[PDB]
Backbone:
């Protein structure tokens, strides 16, 4: 059950990658967008702009670029809310418009999700690269699962088809259409792969080989009906309706194949760059030396029918390999070696017949001055070259009741040949289908599931008769789908008992169908049949009859105002201009009776059977002039339609992402056009009209319960819980209906409800972010103010200035950003308060100080603290400076006395030279001039030192102590040391005067002696 | 014998479309053309023109309009004469020009002849289409044949080399070089195909196993070493040297292989349009569903290494078919099933590593959010995703002396991963190779022929290190060639005994070689090895070092003025600018050691060998250091040149016809360039120096005998005959040299001679056209004259007048033409004489009658007959109308008479009022007045007419008798009528009177009564 496991490959390749979260907080954006085209030029180009504002009935938006535009709500293409991105079914989109539909497709495509539903439709966009979603594991995941129980997938459509066959005992059909290269044939194989798998009986020697034969039939038909073209390297050049037959118990019992419009013209002509049918290249490449010589085979390089396109290989294909694969298929299906060799002989013959050169000769008739080709053809075909040569250039025409030989010229003889080839090829292809059916088809069958694999409407620059046939066929399928849609859609409205009925519908295709295949009056196909049987008549006598029958007489017809070879009918997908050129002959598909007679006698089993069995060599039977081509097709389609009408249909629409076969390249012009012609968009325009969104009450409540007062997500009465929400959101009661199991919504209503939920959660996310930002801001202010209220500033002149320098910094750098925030939060606050006003919710009541008013006051306070901090600094610089002048003075005074305490230390400590009372004592008159100055130099200095100290003290200068000490230490030291020194100078210089008074009088005692 | 049978395949596919008459019938034109540049713009584009008239200094030629340009005879490029077109060997051309060499190559390529010789070279142009020349029948044609015995072919070179081996007991080598997609690999396959046919042990017990393997090794290497590029869908991204080993007897006994410069960068990156190596695509496409969910495989575009170019497929190739072929081939060679899954797991891992997405981490380093890839990679590789995650993002460096892990920024995280991938790829390839060599190689080999499949000189927009390795290699090889060419050239002159000395021309091949691999002084590689091991050395540091070592010094080196990151070296093929970016990293080729450890401990058998076996994981350790990539290469090239110099070599040059991989489009610009670089044009420049053209004597005479008087096609003495032709044509004996077996000529000489053969044949033809036109002319002139001289111009005016108008027409229609012819045959005769003088032979002398001078006279005579003719006509019309007037006069006369007689015949037939003798005899007088005039008319008239008859007889009017009779009748018819008739009237009047006067007489008797 990998269905439930985000890691399984089923989730990896078939489910939209989610962020694995169910709760909330997943939506961080809730804006409303609108899809618009910048330049009204490119209608398919789209941009989405944010809805700026809206009026009573008209939005106004901001183009992704700049300028604003306005549109009336009526034409507005609103973008669906993000939850709708990637929905598995377009029907789940609330806003149902073209760019919306395309957007969802893009979203899924960029994730490699290629299958998506759209109502009854399974849309499948070609990925142009292999994606691993077709493994056996994937197959097993889809068994018995229901359409809405698993992701979109070709396998899901197949299983539902199968279960319905069983559970309803009714036939089913898978109608797969779309452009060339869109992926029809690949999905068609997948459908059959799935069926062979879940309903094929195992072994038992012969019961399980059947499943092998069915699957192997396609390889065969593909080789002969497929070719490389500018649009597809493996283009299908024929319609195909496979029918898988089942028995009562539900097991595969057989299958039959139906072929349509095989483009035979490709066998003789290829547009540059294309290739002929695959077998041609497969044979010339895979053949063996014997086979090559026996068939006179050469190389592509040497065959007209194979060497005019300048292309003989295909990207990634080995024609050698293919041949073997094709041979193997024929083996399993039961083709005998005889038959195969006969088949490859015809392919060989056709090649040679194209190498027959018809030159002009004497008589301006037609000659064949060479036989190589002719002989080679004849040899493999099994017919004498003489008759063939005759039947080619001189066919025997019947003039009355007697036949006489004619002589075609060159170009008329060439065509005759071209027609034998086209005839030979068409009949061989039919033989194969017939042969295959003989082995696989069971005459009696309980039920069957058919798969129609054919192109949708074709509209080239030149549309011929082949084009009218296919567009006619799609007119019928489209009508068949319109009838089924309105059927299945009405049964939905009854099941749920919703009283609603359509009144629009989409103008039927009946009128156009008739303009083409009408009886009375005669349609385009009737006339062409009439105009192609009346003797002398050409293309120009045909269109003329058409103009006169329809121009200005039928609304679906048109006679071009600038051409007389074309005419146009208005099909579902738009008007197509058909070129009348060659229609008469195309509807006649002519082959010389002589050529039939010739090959009618071929010695080959298969060849002779191609010209003898009327069920293959001729059309129906009128009783004179066999049914025409157009008449034959009309009959086949009539048959196909009658079969489909006895089945329960399933529609798969294939889309090509671009015209360059590129992966990862979804182009809007290309996609949108396809969606405007395949019915997908017409389908949405129709259902959009009623109640397109249907949700099962419980699922509704599980998601929107929180929009109503007290309902639980798992409310026990879902229907009543749903009414609660609808009422509370005051939704317009006309916008919905209470179905039996689901709640119905008109277009846009669901989106509006989903927007409400986004607005809600957005409302709370904003509320949340604001609180976080409001706090982070208040906090920042509280912290800065704290810092600014401090008064440290430290203590020097450079210290305070570094703080003044910081404050200038925080005002230029930090303040501004914090200021923006204040006014930005106020903006947010008011927006939220207003948003909450609508949204029908309680007003916002913020915490203590997170109101825009309180944040304003809180900010005014920080501004007031910023100033007081500023004033505090200037005043502290004043002080700090004063302190520096007083400190300088102090230091100076001491640096003074200190120096004097050394200068005068050289005075006291420095004596004289000479003993007596002249050079000794008669000098100490200076000492009295000394201690007279060093008694004032103290009384004046210490007086200043103190006066300075008191001041510093008055400036609460915490540094006074160490000052007063350095001072006190000085005086009680250096100063006294030298102050006392003056003793050993006044006492020692009066002591040596003892020996100048005592030893002085020994020479004074001579005046007595 | 296919060789001599103008209807066999050999002659249809390998021989120019010849003829069967060596006699005289193939050279109708004798005009000498020249090769010029229509627009001086393109140097390699040419146009041929006619030679006006040379001078004893230069030429003069007419373009393809009337732009007669003149060119220095010593500069001109003459076009060889038709006989040289298609020669199997370029050296047989006389005029050796570039446009001349190209023309020959083109004449042959246009007939699908892709092989041509040029000296020792075998030139092979890619045909881009299949040509039936490689079948076993073709193979058989070459056994024991000499290069000159059969047509040019890759098979001839192969056999010659194989004979030389067995004959000389000497090893051989075939060197195949050329641009990408030139066809090097295809021809290498042929050489081997062929060697297996002539030397493979037929097919004994298990003998036909070795060769079965030697062949199977290719699919293997090509699967891992080839890829689709803009130039080749199967480009070999590596060079190789195959060695086919044979025993004593010539039996193949083994094979060895060697790879060179495998471009590892491709595994992680590819340009728009290109693909990664083939296996990546083969695996994803050919893996069985189990293998797919064992290696975690997915589609091509799901892998980064595979979805960056936009291309995932190849024309005509099926990656699943190829994968099967690769596996199948691996079995034949020996890879056990185990090994094979090991190889695919590594290929798978590399792919997975590519998806590991690194992204900006929580900080600045890198982190890995999604672990899917990483885990997948680890799973197949067999390693702990735990350590793998660390080794990639947090590698342990050895900073200091410890192991301090790191954290690389997202950018450097991816590089390391890109480094691991490349290391992983290079080692696997190198491993596959050794494994193949284990099975095929044998140390006991009697001899060997080695085939070198490698690219030629590369010169791209941006050239890097790899380009240098390749251009250096081609420097050696081109020097190896020149040594072998000099050696062989003197051999031809010595034998044959011609005294001639050539130069050695190799004086700068060493100059370029040394500038690159030089040691002292150090060459670019020496400075890169050094710089590569200098701390902090950067790319811009190496470019600067390179500049101060060679810029403005070594004449082969060059410093661009604009680019700072580029530098240029002059190679053999031209200046090559090399970008320095990344060289230091390339030469070092690092790989985080932690990433070595993580894998060293791999659980996988193969992975282990790749990281543990030093023979694979390492370049080679000198112990003290490792060998740089440059050194490693240097030694491998050395080993190769070593082997190649122990062999007799054969050189093949592949050329690509254009840059669009299309057939039938040989383009001058493209081809010439290659011829100019691969050494072919050079060789021709040198070969042009001595004596290029050398013809066998008897062969020369057999063709140019007619040039020398009386020399027979045969001659017992071919030399004397040759001389008699050279002397007679007067030729400078410095322009040739008598060899012993053949005669040698200098460039341009054999052509001049052939131009003389042309001119004689032309003369002879002119001389024939002349007579055919002269004889016809005179025979015509002669007849008009005999015509004009006739004088029978009929009889009335009309007759003569018609001849006058006929003479008028003649002079305006039939004459002018014959006039020019007269004067044009003169010019032809004059010119013819001038020419006959230069060819050196007898002057022309026309038969009696024919010749300008005699023709003039014959025409003068006609011019006279014309004038005498007109005069005769003039004088005859005079006589004719002169006769007309007389004829009129004559008739008028007879008319009067007739109409008169008729009137006087009525009168003579009635007598109604003659009743009176008076009225009657009076009426008889009127009858006498009648006989009066009737007489004077019968006389005058007959006299007039008679005078007219005499006048006519003077004009020789032969119609006289016829006129007379007419006359003599009247006067015996009508005239004698009236005359007699007159009497009837008279004989009645006479009577009615006579028989009345009788009454009147007897009645007159009334006189009495
Ligand atoms: N589902 C797919 N997965 C991979 N390739 C696809 C798928 N569908 C289509 N393609 C590609 O488109 C090509 C055309 O598809 P096809 O079915 O042939 O187109 P149609 O049938 O409409 O003409 C394929 O052959 C293939 O290359
Ligand atoms: Mg199809
Ligand atoms: Mg190659």
Residues:
């Amino acid at each position: 059950n990998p269905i439930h496991d985000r890691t399984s490959d089923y989730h990896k390749y078939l489910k939209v990658k989610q962020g694995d979260s169910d709760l909330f907080k997943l939506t961080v954006s809730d804006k409303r967008y609108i899809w618009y085209n910048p330049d009204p030029d490119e209608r398919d180009s789209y941009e989405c702009g944010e809805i700026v504002s809206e009026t009573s009935d008209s939005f106004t938006f901001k183009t992704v670029d700049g300028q604003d535009r306005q549109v009336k709500k009526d034409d507005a293409n609103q973008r669906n809310p993000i939850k709708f991105d990637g929905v598995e079914d377009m029907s789940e989109l609330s806003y149902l418009n073209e760019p919306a539909v395309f957007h969802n497709l893009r979203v899924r495509y960029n994730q490699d999700l290629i299958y998506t539903y759209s109502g009854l439709f399974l849309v499948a966009v070609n990925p142009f690269k292999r994606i691993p979603i077709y493994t056996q594991e994937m197959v097993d995941i889809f068994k018995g699962r229901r359409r809405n129980e698993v992701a979109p997938h070709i396998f899901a459509i197949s299983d539902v088809a199968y279960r319905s066959m069983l559970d309803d005992r009714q036939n089913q059909s898978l109608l797969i259409t779309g452009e060339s290269g869109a992926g029809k044939t690949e999905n068609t194989k997948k459908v059959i792969q799935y069926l062979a798998s879940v309903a094929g009986r195992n072994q038992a020697n012969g019961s399980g080989v059947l499943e092998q034969q069915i699957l192997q039939a396609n390889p065969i038909l593909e080789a002969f009906g497929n070719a490389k073209t500018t649009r597809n390297n493996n283009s299908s050049e024929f319609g195909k309706f496979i029918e898988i037959q089942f028995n009562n118990a539900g097991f595969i019992s057989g299958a039959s194949i139906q072929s349509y419009l095989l483009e035979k013209s490709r066998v003789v002509f290829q547009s540059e760059t294309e290739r002929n049918y695959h077998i041609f290249y497969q044979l010339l490449a895979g053949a063996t030396a014997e086979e090559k010589k026996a068939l006179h085979l050469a190389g592509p390089e040497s065959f007209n029918y194979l060497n005019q396109s300048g292309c003989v290989d295909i990207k990634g294909v080995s024609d050698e390999d293919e041949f073997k694969i094709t041979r193997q298929a024929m083996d399993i299906v039961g083709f005998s070696q005889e038959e195969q060799m006969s088949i490859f002989k015809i392919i060989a013959g056709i090649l040679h017949l194209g190498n027959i050169k018809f030159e002009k000769g004497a008589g301006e008739g037609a000659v064949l001055k060479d036989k190589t080709a002719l002989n080679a053809a004849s040899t493999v075909f099994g017919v004498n070259p003489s008759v063939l040569e005759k039947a080619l250039m001189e066919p025997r025409i019947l003039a009355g009741r007697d036949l006489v030989a004619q002589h075609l010229n060159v170009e008329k003889s060439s065509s005759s040949r071209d027609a034998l080839v086209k005839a030979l090829y068409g009949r061989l292809f039919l033989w194969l289908v017939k042969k295959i059916n003989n082995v696989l088809c069971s005459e009696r069958k309980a039920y069957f599931i058919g798969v129609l694999d054919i192109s949708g409407f074709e509209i080239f620059k030149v549309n011929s008769f082949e084009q009218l046939c296919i567009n006619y066929t799609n007119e019928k399928l489209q009508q068949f789908f319109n009838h089924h849609m309105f059927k299945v859609e009405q049964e939905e409205y009854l099941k749920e008992k919703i009283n609603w009925t359509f009144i629009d519908f989409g103008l039927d295709s009946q009128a156009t169908i008739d303009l083409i295949d009408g009886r009375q009056p005669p349609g385009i196909l009737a006339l062409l049949d009439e105009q192609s049987v009346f003797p002398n008549a050409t293309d120009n006598t045909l269109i003329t009859k058409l103009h006169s029958h329809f121009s200005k007489k039928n609304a679906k017809y048109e006679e071009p105002r600038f051409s007389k070879t074309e005419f146009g009918v208005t099909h579902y997908a738009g008007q197509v201009m058909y070129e009348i050129q060659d229609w008469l002959e195309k509807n006649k598909d002519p082959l010389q009776q002589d050529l039939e007679l010739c090959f009618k006698d071929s010695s080959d089993n298969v060849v002779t059977k191609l010209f003898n069995d009327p069920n293959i060599a001729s059309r129906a039977k009128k009783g004179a002039n066999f049914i025409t081509v157009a008449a034959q097709y009309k009959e086949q389609l009539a048959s196909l339609m009658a079969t489909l009408e006895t089945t329960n249909p399933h529609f798969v629409r294939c889309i090509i992402p671009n015209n360059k076969q590129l992966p990862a390249k979804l182009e809007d012009k290309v996609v949108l056009d396809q969606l405007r012609c395949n019915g997908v968009l017409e389908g949405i325009r129709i259902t959009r009209k009623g109640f397109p969104n249907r949700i099962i009450y419980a699922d509704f409540v599980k998601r929107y319960y929180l929009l109503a007062p007290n309902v639980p997500r798992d409310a026990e009465d879902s229907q009543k819980a749903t009414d609660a929400v609808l009422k509370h959101l005051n939704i317009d009661p006309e916008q919905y209906r209470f179905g039996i199991t689901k709640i119905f919504f008109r277009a846009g209503q669901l989106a509006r409800i989903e927007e409400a939920r986004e607005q809600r959660l957005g409302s709370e996310q904003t509320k949340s972010d604001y609180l976080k930002r409001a706090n982070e801001l208040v906090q920042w202010i509280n912290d800065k103010q704290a810092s600014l209220e401090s008064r440290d500033f430290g203590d020097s002149i450079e210290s305070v200035q570094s703080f003044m320098n910081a404050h200038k910094e925080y005002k230029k750098t930090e303040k501004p950003p914090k200021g923006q925030e204040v006014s930005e939060l106020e903006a947010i606050y008011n927006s939220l308060q207003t948003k909450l006003r609508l949204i029908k919710r309680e007003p916002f009541v913020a915490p203590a100080g997170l109101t825009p008013n309180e944040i304003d006051s809180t900010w005014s306070a920080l501004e007031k603290a910023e100033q007081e901090h500023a004033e505090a600094l200037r005043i502290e610089l004043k002080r700090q400076k004063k302190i520096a002048v007083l400190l300088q003075k102090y230091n100076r005074i001491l640096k003074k006395l200190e120096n004097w305490a050394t200068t005068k230390s050289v005075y006291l400590g420095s004596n004289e030279t000479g003993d007596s009372i002249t050079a000794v004592q008669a000098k100490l008159k200076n000492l009295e001039a000394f201690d007279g100055e060093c008694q004032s130099l103290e009384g004046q200095s210490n007086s200043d030192l103190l006066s300075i100290l008191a001041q510093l003290t008055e400036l609460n200068y915490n540094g006074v102590p160490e000052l007063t000490e350095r001072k006190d230490t000085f005086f009680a030291q250096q100063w006294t040391g030298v102050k006392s020194s003056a003793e050993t100078y006044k006492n020692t210089l009066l002591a040596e005067l003892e020996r100048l008074q005592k030893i002085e009088d020994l020479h004074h005692h001579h005046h007595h002696h």
User: Anything to note?
Assistant: The two ends of chain A are 156 Å apart (CA to CA). The longest helix of chain A spans residues 852-903. Residues 32-79 of chain A form a domain with the SH3 type barrels. fold (CATH 2.30.30.360). Residues B 184-185, 236, 453 surround magnesium ion (ligand 3) (CB under 6 Å).
